[PDB]
């Protein structure tokens, strides 16, 4: 999800954008700004929340040895989802 600064310059996923009075914008004249269009934060928010019927789940990121180190997430707090912090994946227990 790219965004455009008031000076017409694209804003990167880290929020970088040269100021209006910044001289360093001259380097893009007759050239372009390298910005990646896909935002990981947006994509991982687009990911749905998995529901499993256990207090503790394990995530390895998918693929086994091709993922991340396997971690265990405690799904006891009913006011929030448990997030695997390697891959940002949300898990929850079936409520109601």
């Amino acid at each position: 999800g790219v965004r455009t600064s008031p000076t017409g310059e694209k804003v990167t996923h880290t929020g970088q954008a040269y100021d209006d009075g910044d001289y360093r914008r001259v380097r893009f004249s007759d050239r372009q700004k390298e910005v990646n269009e896909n935002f990981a934060i947006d994509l991982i928010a687009e990911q749905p929340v998995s529901e499993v019927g256990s207090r503790v789940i394990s995530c390895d990121g998918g693929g086994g040895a091709l993922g991340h180190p396997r971690v265990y997430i405690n799904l006891d707090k009913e006011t929030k989802t448990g997030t695997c912090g390697y891959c940002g994946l949300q898990f929850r227990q079936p409520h109601h």
Binding site: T12, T14, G15, Q16, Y18, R24, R27, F28, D30, R31, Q32, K33, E34
Partner: peptide
Amino acid sequence: PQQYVPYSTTR
């Protein structure tokens, strides 16, 4: 004009 131009990605 499509060539890569570097910049600092930090605020």
